[PDB]
Structure 1
Amino acid sequence: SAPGTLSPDARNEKQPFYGEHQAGILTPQQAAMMLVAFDVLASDKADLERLFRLLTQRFAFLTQGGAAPETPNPRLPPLDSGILGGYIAPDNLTITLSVGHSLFDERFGLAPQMPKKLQKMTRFPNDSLDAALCHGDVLLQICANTQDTVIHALRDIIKHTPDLLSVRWKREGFISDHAARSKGKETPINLLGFKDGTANPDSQNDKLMQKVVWVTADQQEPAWTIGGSYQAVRLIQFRVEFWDRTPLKEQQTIFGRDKQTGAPLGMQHEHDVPDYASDPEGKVIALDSHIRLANPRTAESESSLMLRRGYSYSLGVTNSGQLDMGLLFVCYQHDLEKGFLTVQKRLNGEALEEYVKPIGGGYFFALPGVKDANDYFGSALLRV
């Protein structure tokens, strides 16, 4: 159920761009998402500040919306693509900017101000990482009620940054219609047909998000990071036809949840909690399962908790001739090793691996929010 969902029909709804934190983390999932990574063509730190200043301006506009920028001189390219007609409605659009490890090399002199746990994504046991689709100096997470709004934001950004950014990879996706419209009531479904998001820590609870999601001042990190969040992204294909052929008994066993209800196997309500303490032979919920490995529920390692904010994607056909669909996995943590790396390490060997093929993504650090109109993305990172 956390972080919730927002209606696809809310053309006029606005999500606050300005805050202590960035939007599109705790924000209830919009119906459309884009993940688009860029390589940075900035020549020096000053050129980098230009970019972040430029971005703030653009996001602030796109996010709260307005009349389209018109073209009084037809001899110039139109200042807008025109794909939303003559008005740019907010449409719950949120754009979350995050920085990759590569950004902290010789190029901009930021090495000593790197986040401590931040690293490059390296293959895991089941991975088939394609380089075309990994890493990047910056990632944008572009979320909105509709595809239009998202696609509109990109091309605006591109238009304003042609000596400044270079598109590296991109995937678009969605959350499931019925649940999108359920305004937070129903849990979104993945293309494997299982409710997905259930056990996420409550996103409304400010105090818990300080412990789980948000970088806090008690942390060994550099002080610009305070208010940011480590971000893991994994592009994961499904063997979908093979899955559709797999016994229901086997599907639930693999996840350790009831497909129809979303309850832990044995139990009756989606927000029911299993107790593995009773089940150490792993006879109700398998030790093999995604749920039990993902979280042993020891509470001794509640420290590995995270907010997962994923989307289904569906593309074309694989080289091997099969359907190309799956999860655009996205998660936020206050600490990447304590979170994503700890859980994934813990998942290596799970029964699900036979059906899933991670192929892309990267690790990134999400910036602290932009406090007011006088601030800009990573302003603390650039002074100090």
Structure 2
Amino acid sequence: GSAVPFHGAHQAGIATPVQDRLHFAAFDVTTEDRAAFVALLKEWTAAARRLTAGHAVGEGAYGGLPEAPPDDTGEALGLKPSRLTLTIGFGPSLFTRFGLADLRPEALADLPKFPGDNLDRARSGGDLCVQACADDPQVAVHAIRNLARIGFGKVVVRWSQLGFGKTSSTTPDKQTPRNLLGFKDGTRNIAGTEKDRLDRFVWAAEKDGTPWMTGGSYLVARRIRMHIETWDRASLQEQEDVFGRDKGEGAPVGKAKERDEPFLKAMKPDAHVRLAHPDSNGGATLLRRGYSFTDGTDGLGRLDAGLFFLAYQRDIRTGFVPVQRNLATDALNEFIQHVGSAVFAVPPGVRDADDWWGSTLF
């Protein structure tokens, strides 16, 4: 129920312990006025400071002038902060506006087409994103709703994704959650305590070539549909062979415990863990921070199910791209399809009460 501090050198919501719920929204910008957009970023920052401390935005949810709409929509009244974090990112398309073209980071790379991609263009891309994570879904929806309202006339929601449960871990001392295939997901991640590993693999450094991004990170989002009918008829051995870990304990094949180190040569050559492991990818390491989703039925008699995969990294070209390229032969590909994609530059943290989202860029 506690608050996660909002200010810092880095934005919260990355290294932070992974909260139970996600509401992710991508926005397109509809104003060509730079000053108007800067004013929005400041108003959003002010709102975020309220929201993440469990307070209502603006002058509150009630007790104002009867003839005015309340400043806050009110559905989070009486609720705790619930570890709400709000993380903003800027998409490549933003940099075509406001004279920003030459400030687009090299590390904000467009992704290549990957074999098997079936990307919905309507649920891909976006000028900007807001990741809202919290332990209470109502708290997360309230935050996104109120930001969108404040931004009316300057930004529109392009697409959104709710995540009902986490499929990631930045806290190895706590139980690793399972994805909808029934496997633990998050054992070998980067922990929030691993400052050296965060600095090496997650945070952008001044020397990487884009000074305004120092202390930021780069985000890849992939909406992945799971073929659960196909998976559910697979044998136990087939499932375990796909991953290279057993299902019950989630230990590497041959070993007894979840957190025993993988011995890659005992896994099938097309096992997911074997192909995704840093040692298979020249050391490339990601911070995975995704969530599960179900968006109803598929119209063919079955539940829809998927994973909204989020990865943070210091450079898209040295993080997600090499690892995904190496997944071209993954046994897991029989059971999944990527159907949405976006990339974002996640700026540095809001340093104090006078700072604002995007201040280093603008």
Displacement of 1:176: 5.7
Q: Out of 63, 68, 73, which is 1:76 matched to?
A: 68
Residue in structure 1 matched with residue 204 of structure 2 by the alignment:
215
Alignment-mate amino acid for residue 114 of structure 2: F
Structure 1 segment 302-317 matched on structure 2, within 5 A: 302=283, 304-317=284-297
Q: Out of 32, 35, 57, which is 2:46 matched to?
A: 57
Q: Out of 316, 322, 326, which is 2:306 matched to?
A: 326
Structure 1 segment 11-90 matched on structure 2, within 5 A: 13-66=2-55, 68-85=60-77, 87=78, 89-90=80-81
Alignment-mate amino acid for residue 148 of structure 2: I
Q: TM-score, normalised by structure 1?
A: 0.89
- Partners of 1:58 and 1:120 in 2: how far apart? 31
Alignment-mate amino acid for residue 231 of structure 2: W
Alignment-mate amino acid for residue 81 of structure 1: T
Deviates more, 1:73-82 or 1:166-175: 73-82
Indicate if the aligned counterparts of 1:241 and 1:323 stay in contact, CA closer than 8 A.
no
Alignment-mate amino acid for residue 372 of structure 1: D
1:64-91: CA deviation from partner (whole Å, max 9, x where unpaired)? 1225432422222222222223x45311
SS of 1:230's equivalent in the other structure is strand
Displacement of 1:314: 1.2
SS of 1:52's equivalent in the other structure is helix
- Partners of 1:202 and 1:172 in 2: how far apart? 24
- Stretches of structure 1 lacking an aligned partner (at least 5 in a row): 1-9
Say yes or no: does 1:301 pair with 2:282. yes
Say yes or no: does 1:251 pair with 2:251. no
SS of 1:148's equivalent in the other structure is helix
- Partners of 2:277 and 2:83 in 1: how far apart? 32
Residue in structure 2 matched with residue 201 of structure 1 by the alignment:
190
Displacement of 1:120: 3.3
Residue in structure 1 matched with residue 82 of structure 2 by the alignment:
91
Deviating runs (4+, > 6 A) in structure 1? none
SS of 1:18's equivalent in the other structure is coil
Deviates more, 1:142-151 or 1:312-321: 312-321
Indicate if the aligned counterparts of 1:62 and 1:88 stay in contact, CA closer than 8 A.
no
Residue in structure 2 matched with residue 5 of structure 1 by the alignment:
none
Alignment-mate amino acid for residue 327 of structure 1: L
Say yes or no: does 1:286 pair with 2:277. no
- Partners of 2:153 and 2:109 in 1: how far apart? 27
Relative to structure 1, is the Cα distance of residues 318 and 157 closer, same or farther in structure 2, using a 3 angstrom cutoff? same
Alignment-mate amino acid for residue 233 of structure 1: A
Relative to structure 1, is the Cα distance of residues 217 and 157 closer, same or farther in structure 2, using a 3 angstrom cutoff? same
- Stretches of structure 2 lacking an aligned partner (at least 5 in a row): none
SS of 2:26's equivalent in the other structure is strand
Report the RMSD for the aligned CA atoms in angstroms.
2.0
Indicate if the aligned counterparts of 1:123 and 1:129 stay in contact, CA closer than 8 A.
no
